[PDB]
Curated annotation (Swiss-Prot):
Negative results: does not inhibit alpha-4-beta-2 (CHRNA4-CHRNB2) nAChR (IC(50)=10.400 uM or >20 uM). The chain holds residues 44 to 56 of 60 of the full protein. It is found in: Secreted. The modification Cysteine amide is found at C13. Changing T5A: 16-fold decrease in inhibition of alpha-6/alpha-3-beta-2-beta-3 (CHRNA6/CHRNA3-CHRNB2-CHRNB3) nAChR, 2-fold decrease in inhibition of alpha-6/alpha-3-beta-4 (CHRNA6/CHRNA3-CHRNB4) nAChR. It comes from Conus bullatus. Changing S4A: No change in inhibition of alpha-6/alpha-3-beta-2-beta-3 (CHRNA6/CHRNA3-CHRNB2-CHRNB3) nAChR. 4-fold decrease in inhibition of alpha-6/alpha-3-beta-4 (CHRNA6/CHRNA3-CHRNB4) nAChR. Alpha-conotoxins bind to the nicotinic acetylcholine receptors (nAChR) and inhibit them. This peptide potently blocks numerous mammalian nAChR subtypes: alpha-6/alpha-3-beta-2 (CHRNA6/CHRNA3-CHRNB2) (IC(50)=0.258 nM) > alpha-6/alpha-3-beta-4 (CHRNA6/CHRNA3-CHRNB4) (IC(50)=1.54 nM) > alpha-3-beta-2 (CHRNA3-CHRNB2) (IC(50)=5.72 nM) > alpha-3-beta-4 (CHRNA3-CHRNB4)(IC(50)=27.7 nM) > alpha-4-beta-4 (CHRNA4-CHRNB4) (IC(50)=69.9 nM) > alpha-2-beta-4 (CHRNA2-CHRNB4) (IC(50)=121 nM) > alpha-7 (CHRNA7) (IC(50)=272 nM) > alpha-2-beta-2 (CHRNA2-CHRNB2) (IC(50)=800 nM). This is Alpha-conotoxin BuIA. Belongs to the conotoxin A superfamily. Disulfide bonds join C2-C8, C3-C13. The native globular disulfide connectivity of this toxin displays multiple conformations in solution. In contrast, the non-native ribbon isomer has a well-defined conformation. This ribbon isomer is inactive on alpha-3-beta-2 (CHRNA3-CHRNB2) and alpha-3-beta-4 (CHRNA3-CHRNB4)nAChR. Post-translational modification of Pro-6 into hydroxyproline [P49O] induces a 2800-fold decrease in inhibition of alpha-6/alpha-3-beta-2-beta-3 (CHRNA6/CHRNA3-CHRNB2-CHRNB3) and 6-fold decrease in inhibition of alpha-6/alpha-3-beta-4 (CHRNA6/CHRNA3-CHRNB4). Expressed by the venom duct.
Amino acid sequence: GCCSTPPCAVLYC
């Protein structure tokens, strides 16, 4: 997806 790669705030993007 989008923020599938850390360290994002919404990993479940």
